[PDB]
Amino acid sequence: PTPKYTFTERAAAGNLSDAEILNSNNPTGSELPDESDVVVGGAGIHGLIYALHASKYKPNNLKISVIEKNTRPGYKIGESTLPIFYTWCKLHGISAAYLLRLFGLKDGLCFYFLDRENQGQYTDFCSVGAPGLVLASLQIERPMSELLFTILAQRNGVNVYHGREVDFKSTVVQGGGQGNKIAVSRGKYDSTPKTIDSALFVDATGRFRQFCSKKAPRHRFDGWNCNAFWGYFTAPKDESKIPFDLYEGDHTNHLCFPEGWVWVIRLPSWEGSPIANLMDMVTYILECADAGVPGDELPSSEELARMFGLKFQWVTSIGFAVRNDVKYPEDLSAYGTREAEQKFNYFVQKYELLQQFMSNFELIENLYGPGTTWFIRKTLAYQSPVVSGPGWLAIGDACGFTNPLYSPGINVGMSTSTWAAQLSHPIVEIGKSAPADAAESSIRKLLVPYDDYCKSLVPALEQMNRFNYVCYRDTRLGPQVACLWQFFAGIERYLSDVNIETFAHYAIKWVWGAMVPEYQQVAQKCIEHIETVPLDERLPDAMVDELLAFSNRIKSAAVAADDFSLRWDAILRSFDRSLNFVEGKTSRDIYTRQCSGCGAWLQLRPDWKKCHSCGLLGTEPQTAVTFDPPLTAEEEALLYAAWNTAPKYDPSKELKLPTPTRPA
Numbered sequence: 001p002t003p004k005y006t007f008t009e010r011a012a013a014g015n016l017s018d019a020e021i022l023n024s025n026n027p028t029g030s031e032l033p034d035e036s037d038v039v040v041g042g043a044g045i046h047g048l049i050y051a052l053h054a055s056k057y058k059p060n061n062l063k064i065s066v067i068e069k070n071t072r073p074g075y076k077i078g079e080s081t082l083p084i085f086y087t088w089c090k091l092h093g094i095s096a097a098y099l100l101r102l103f104g105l106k107d108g109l110c111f112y113f114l115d116r117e118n119q120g121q122y123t124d125f126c127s128v129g130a131p132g133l134v135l136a137s138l139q140i141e142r143p144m145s146e147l148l149f150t151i152l153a154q155r156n157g158v159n160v161y162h163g164r165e166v167d168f169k170s171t172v173v174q175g176g177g178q179g180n181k182i183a184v185s186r187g188k189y190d191s192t193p194k195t196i197d198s199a200l201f202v203d204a205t206g207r208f209r210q211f212c213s214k215k216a217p218r219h220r221f222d223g224w225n226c227n228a229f230w231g232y233f234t235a236p237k238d239e240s241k242i243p244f245d246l247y248e249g250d251h252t253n254h255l256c257f258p259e260g261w262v263w264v265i266r267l268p269s270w271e272g273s274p275i276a277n278l279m280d281m282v283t284y285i286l287e288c289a290d291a292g293v294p295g296d297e298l299p300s301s302e303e304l305a306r307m308f309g310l311k312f313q314w315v316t317s318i319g320f321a322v323r324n325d326v327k328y329p330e331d332l333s334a335y336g337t338r339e340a341e342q343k344f345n346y347f348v349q350k351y352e353l354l355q356q357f358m359s360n361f362e363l364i365e366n367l368y369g370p371g372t373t374w375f376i377r378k379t380l381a382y383q384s385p386v387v388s389g390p391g392w393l394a395i396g397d398a399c400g401f402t403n404p405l406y407s408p409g410i411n412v413g414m415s416t417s418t419w420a421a422q423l424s425h426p427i428v429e430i431g432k433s434a435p436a437d438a439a440e441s442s443i444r445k446l447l448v449p450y451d452d453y454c455k456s457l458v459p460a461l462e463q464m465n466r467f468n469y470v471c472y473r474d475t476r477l478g479p480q481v482a483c484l485w486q487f488f489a490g491i492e493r494y495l496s497d498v499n500i501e502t503f504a505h506y507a508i509k510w511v512w513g514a515m516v517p518e519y520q521q522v523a524q525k526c527i528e529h530i531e532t533v534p535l536d537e538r539l540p541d542a543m544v545d546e547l548l549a550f551s552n553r554i555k556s557a558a559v560a561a562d563d564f565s566l567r568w569d570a571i572l573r574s575f576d577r578s579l580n581f582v583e584g585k586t587s588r589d590i591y592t593r594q595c596s597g598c599g600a601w602l603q604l605r606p607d608w609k610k611c612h613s614c615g616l617l618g619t620e621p622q623t624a625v626t627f628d629p630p631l632t633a634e635e636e637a638l639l640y641a642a643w644n645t646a647p648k649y650d651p652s653k654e655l656k657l658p659t660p661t662r663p664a
């Protein structure tokens with residue numbers, strides 16, 4: 001495809017504001033419709049996942065308008081995504097060759113556990129992603145992902161209006177398909193608000209809970225909660241001075257310690273780019289995805305920046321997520337002038353390994369505009385008690401949230417988004433096909449499983465977070481108990497079978513394994529023991545002994561019961577085939593490599609000879625995956641064959657669950 005500069009030229013020709021050039025790509029047009037089936041408040045990632053999944057699940061059935069108050073896709077924290085998310089992208093027609101032009105490569109999760117009372121000591125837990133011919137995971141800049149999903153939505157009959165705000169004071173939401181009247185303005189100053197008459201409202205306003213907070217107060221869990229503070233840093237090409245052995249920048253890296261943990265995420269940034277130019281670049285990438293352009297013939301990230309007049313750079317997202325029962329010194333003005341800055345630099349110098357690590361990174365000033373060098377957010381975890389009701393439902397963060405750790409936010413949260421997308425078709429049709437009282441009753445009953453799933457979802461994620469946090473207080477519990485159980489219970493068994501039709505059903509069965517019984521039994525023994533040791537104390541060695549032995553005893557039976565064949569010793573660096581810990585083990589599969597030219601991390605596959613980020617040609621041999629233990633040519637061919645394309649929908653197939661096989 002020859003690249004078009006439609007939006008760049010349209011914007012210049014009419015001197016269009018940012019929201020005006022975006023809204024001009026709507027199928028219905030730049031202005032709001034009088035009527036719609038579904039109005040979605042908020043075009044965060046979940047508002048857009050919802051609209052894309054709803055229209056793709058059953059095309060040309062629902063008219064859907066998304067209202068987003070940001071004039072353009074705004075900054076958001078929450079950048080790490082997982083195989084289920086990529087699979088969802090691939091099911092919606094965008095595979096890794098195209099996604100990697102926009103987003104950073106993620107190849108598994110690695111953890112380093114720092115000893116507090118013995119500064120310099122650490123242990124690790126390392127896993128891998130997948131071969132480039134199986135799948136990828138992504139590190140996404142959220143203004144870019146929201147742009148990609150806006151454009152994809154508009155190309156699929158969904159209207160998306162930026163710079164428009166739902167007025168939750170004058171909006172009327174009523175049940176039984178009688179009719180919502182959603183008030184949409186450009187802000188509180190706006191004299192001329194519009195109304196969209198509609199059947200269903202979707203609250204996707206995130207943590208702001210702008211609608212469902214009117215139906216129930218925010219709910220907090222017992223015990224400590226968490227705070228976060230973070231910033232953006234350079235991404236070094238040469239990672240060899242990082243003080244951890246075998247560190248790799250294309251993992252989501254976790255630096256863990258008694259008070260909490262630090263995320264390290266390498267991802268490219270498009271900040272400084274004009275919005276119209278970005279629309280042309282994204283539109284071109286989708287046209288390339290439509291045409292099936294091979295990766296080696298697709299222009300590199302940097303070439304796209306030159307082609308469309310964009311700004312491109314590599315940055316590292318580094319942040320703290322710590323408990324809110326930590327004791328800070330009263331005076332912290334030696335570490336900065338803002339609180340977020342102060343607590344960040346204070347915590348860095350509390351750990352010699354953190355200070356040594358951070359000394360490889362240079363701080364970026366105001367990457368996302370003024371005032372954005374530092375971020376802080378306090379009291380992270382919460383739950384919405386009421387997530388649906390007559391005329392409305394809520395998705396994503398508006399239902400609840402726990403912690404950045406293991407990225408439940410996007411990757412687990414999309415179970416609600418996609419299930420709600422599927423549920424919306426009968427909800428609207430019920431309203432159009434039955435009188436009001438019966439419609440409201442039938443819809444209420446239809447939504448009981450959605451309400452009940454949501455009600456139980458956040459508490460299970462909360463216990464998962466506390467399980468990991470308490471085990472992060474010891475350098476043996478962290479890797480050998482918490483991480484081991486998360487990956488065993490939460491690895492996505494049978495993901496290669498998921499399609500558009502089964503996706504919501506599969507996703508709600510995942511929950512990162514947090515509902516698995518043996519997982520909760522180990523999680524409860526650990527939490528019950530460790531929560532009785534004050535944070536400023538070291539866990540007694542006998543307590544670690546007892547917990548480690550308990551976990552390994554439950555583990556052996558649950559592992560034996562699982563009927564899913566996995567090369568566990570190839571996927572977890574520190575464990576053998578039966579998930580036994582091996583003290584010195586170091587052998588794992590190798591799926592990635594770092595570009596000698598630009599530093600970007602690449603997936604190994606024979607048909608990707610050039611770097612997708614800068615276009616530099618690597619040597620042919622480098623494209624060879626290393627399987628340890630080895631695979632035959634047939635075993636390798638059989639692997640890649642399973643992951644080529646998703647299966648057609650068979651209404652007689654039993655859905656195979658991601659969680660491990662029950663013992664019974």
Ligand SMILES: Cc1cc2nc3c(=O)[nH]c(=O)nc-3n(C[C@H](O)[C@H](O)[C@H](O)COP(=O)(O)OP(=O)(O)OC[C@H]3O[C@@H](n4cnc5c(N)ncnc54)[C@H](O)[C@@H]3O)c2cc1C
Nearest residue numbers: 042044045046069078080166205206396397404407409410
């Ligand atoms: C420190 C931290 C780190 C995290 N890291 C990760 C991670 O690595 N991976 C991960 O998966 N998750 C992560 N999360 C969680 C993640 O950020 C959220 O789960 C995710 O962004 C939820 O997005 P959403 O679409 O639900 O809401 P949001 O992205 O918050 O979108 C809400 C939207 O609603 C709009 N809006 C609000 N009011 C109105 C109105 N009246 N009219 C119109 N529009 C309105 C806002 O402008 C906004 O665009 C992290 C969270 C935190 C706090």
Ligand SMILES: CC1(C)c2[nH]c3ccccc3c2C[C@@]23CN4CCC[C@]4(C[C@@H]12)C(=O)N3
Nearest residue numbers: 083127128129130131134487490491492571
């Ligand atoms: C299931 C998968 C998405 C996955 N989910 C994880 C969760 C936590 C830690 C590691 C993983 C992995 C690595 C896997 C294991 N599978 C072996 C055959 C195909 C596949 C898919 C992929 C692979 O190549 N790598």
Ligand SMILES: CC1(C)c2[nH]c3ccccc3c2C[C@@]23CN4CCC[C@]4(C[C@@H]12)C(=O)N3
Nearest residue numbers: 419449504505506508650651652653654655
């Ligand atoms: C298992 C089932 C009760 C179910 N449980 C859910 C939970 C959440 C969301 C959706 C579902 C569904 C829909 C299913 C999926 N199954 C495919 C083969 C037979 C069956 C039974 C039924 C079917 O036809 N529809």
Ligand SMILES: [Cl-]
Nearest residue numbers: 080252406407
């Ligand atoms: Cl993650």
Ligand SMILES: [Zn+2]
Nearest residue numbers: 595598611614
């Ligand atoms: Zn390169």
